[PDB]
Design an enzyme around this catalytic site. Structure first.
Site, PDB file in Angstrom:
ATOM      1  N   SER A   1       3.303  83.899  42.847  1.00 35.13           N
ATOM      2  CA  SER A   1       4.611  83.116  43.516  1.00 35.13           C
ATOM      3  C   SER A   1       4.218  82.090  44.537  1.00 35.13           C
ATOM      4  CB  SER A   1       5.641  84.355  43.948  1.00 35.13           C
ATOM      5  OG  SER A   1       5.763  85.133  43.023  1.00 35.13           O
TER       6      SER A   1
ATOM      7  N   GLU B   1       5.216  84.610  33.628  1.00 38.97           N
ATOM      8  CA  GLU B   1       3.990  84.540  32.918  1.00 38.97           C
ATOM      9  C   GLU B   1       2.682  84.356  33.465  1.00 38.97           C
ATOM     10  OE1 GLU B   1       5.019  82.250  28.911  1.00 38.97           O
ATOM     11  OE2 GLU B   1       5.485  80.733  30.187  1.00 38.97           O
TER      12      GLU B   1
HETATM   13  C1  LIG Z   1       5.274  86.387  42.545  1.00 37.89           C
HETATM   14  O1  LIG Z   1       4.246  86.454  43.240  1.00 37.89           O
HETATM   15  C2  LIG Z   1       6.095  87.623  42.604  1.00 37.89           C
HETATM   16  C3  LIG Z   1       6.925  88.077  43.540  1.00 37.89           C
HETATM   17  N1  LIG Z   1       6.503  87.497  44.982  1.00 37.89           N
HETATM   18  C4  LIG Z   1       6.075  88.305  45.658  1.00 37.89           C
HETATM   19  C5  LIG Z   1       5.599  87.962  46.930  1.00 37.89           C
HETATM   20  O2  LIG Z   1       6.174  87.094  47.577  1.00 37.89           O
HETATM   21  O3  LIG Z   1       4.483  88.473  47.626  1.00 37.89           O
HETATM   22  C6  LIG Z   1       5.747  89.697  44.893  1.00 37.89           C
HETATM   23  S1  LIG Z   1       5.888  91.022  45.997  1.00 37.89           S
HETATM   24  C7  LIG Z   1       7.713  91.396  46.370  1.00 37.89           C
HETATM   25  C8  LIG Z   1       8.392  91.038  47.547  1.00 37.89           C
HETATM   26  N2  LIG Z   1       9.783  91.588  47.192  1.00 37.89           N
HETATM   27  C9  LIG Z   1       9.438  92.728  46.609  1.00 37.89           C
HETATM   28  C10 LIG Z   1       9.649  93.834  47.868  1.00 37.89           C
HETATM   29  O4  LIG Z   1      10.208  93.556  48.860  1.00 37.89           O
HETATM   30  N3  LIG Z   1       9.209  95.078  47.789  1.00 37.89           N
HETATM   31  C11 LIG Z   1       9.029  96.019  46.328  1.00 37.89           C
HETATM   32  C12 LIG Z   1       9.103  96.105  48.906  1.00 37.89           C
HETATM   33  C13 LIG Z   1       8.101  92.847  46.242  1.00 37.89           C
HETATM   34  C14 LIG Z   1       6.836  89.567  43.969  1.00 37.89           C
HETATM   35  C15 LIG Z   1       6.643  90.509  42.413  1.00 37.89           C
HETATM   36  C16 LIG Z   1       6.601  87.818  41.132  1.00 37.89           C
HETATM   37  C17 LIG Z   1       8.420  87.289  41.240  1.00 37.89           C
HETATM   38  O5  LIG Z   1       6.375  87.447  39.870  1.00 37.89           O
END
Ligand SMILES: *C(=O)[C@@H]([C@@H]1N=C(C(=O)O)[C@@H](S[C@@H]2CN[C@H](C(=O)N(C)C)C2)[C@@H]1C)[C@@H](C)O
Length: 267
Positions: A46, A145
């Site tokens: 991301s 993806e």
């Molecule tokens: C992309 O990397 C993915 C999303 N982006 C994330 C990130 O910024 O690290 C991950 S972790 C995500 C942060 N919000 C969720 C949360 O608060 N927890 C479960 C506590 C986890 C996220 C998967 C993706 C969108 O492809």
């Protein structure tokens, strides 16, 4: 010699978790830099949403888009992990609110929509990066993806150096005018997903803007930040990590620690 020691410490920190850390850091105040594996490629995850928000702000600046234009999507099947866009499905969001949601909450709905209508998809995002003189960045696939994080796959990778350089150009440089640059600065400051990463690597008095990424594969995770230290010039810190086995989980702690090491190296 400071460099050589910072590197031994990254070296060890990567062996400890059986993986692969990429670091680039810049003290804008002196020009001092530290890189370790800074020209190797690593999956963006991301983390590209940070740039994606910037490309939005460039189009606003160029007058091609308006920051308050309504974006409607009431029939969309919202991608997984669209926490903000879900709560406004019915009424739409302003372009700006949507872009910031993409940055600050890693909202895939916001991401894919912006890339569909405004940016020319992944190739358009790659074109933006080229246009500010980043030759390493490539985005190949769409929000959900691009997360496979396969060792040796150049799709949806950049390098720590290129990421750091781009962030500097965007958050501190002149790609964006004074007003528009400040907006982008505030968006980064309001990131909600970075508390355990680069934020955890600095005194709590320092102001940080960042974008994280977590592939959820090969324990791949990253963070890049602009840091405004007390009565000091800005730092840029770029940290990317992968692990050897598909099933491995990412490691906030490793990221925070490589950040500490990197900040000291340029201090
Ligand atoms: C992309 O990397 C993915 C999303 N982006 C994330 C990130 O910024 O690290 C991950 S972790 C995500 C942060 N919000 C969720 C949360 O608060 N927890 C479960 C506590 C986890 C996220 C998967 C993706 C969108 O492809």
């Amino acid at each position: 010699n400071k460099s050589d020691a910072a590197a031994k410490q990254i070296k060890k920190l990567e062996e400890d978790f059986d993986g692969r850390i990429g670091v680039f850091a810049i003290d804008t105040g002196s020009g001092n830099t530290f890189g370790y594996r800074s020209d190797e490629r690593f999956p963006l995850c991301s983390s590209f949403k940070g740039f994606l928000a910037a490309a939005v702000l460039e189009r606003v600046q160029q007058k091609k888009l308006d920051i308050n234009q309504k974006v409607k999507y009431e029939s969309r099947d919202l991608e997984y992990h669209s926490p903000i866009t879900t709560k406004y499905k019915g009424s739409g969001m302003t372009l700006g609110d949507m872009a910031s949601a993409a940055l600050q909450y890693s909202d895939n709905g916001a991401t894919n929509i912006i890339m569909e209508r405004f940016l020319g998809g992944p190739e358009g995002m790659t074109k933006f990066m080229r246009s500010i003189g980043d030759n390493e960045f490539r985005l190949d696939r769409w929000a959900l993806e691009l997360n496979t994080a396969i060792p040796g796959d150049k799709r949806d990778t950049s390098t720590p150096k290129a990421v750091a350089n781009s962030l500097n150009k965007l958050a501190l440089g002149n790609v964006l005018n004074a007003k528009v640059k400040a907006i982008y600065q505030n968006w980064l400051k309001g990131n909600t997903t970075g508390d355990a990463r680069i934020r955890a690597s600095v005194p709590a008095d320092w102001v940080v803007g960042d974008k994280t990424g977590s592939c959820g594969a090969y324990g791949t995770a990253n963070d890049y930040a602009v840091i405004w230290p007390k009565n000091r010039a800005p730092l840029i810190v770029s940290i990317y990590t992968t692990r050897k086995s598909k099933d491995d989980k990412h490691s906030d702690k490793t990221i925070a620690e490589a950040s500490r090491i990197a900040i000291q190296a340029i201090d």
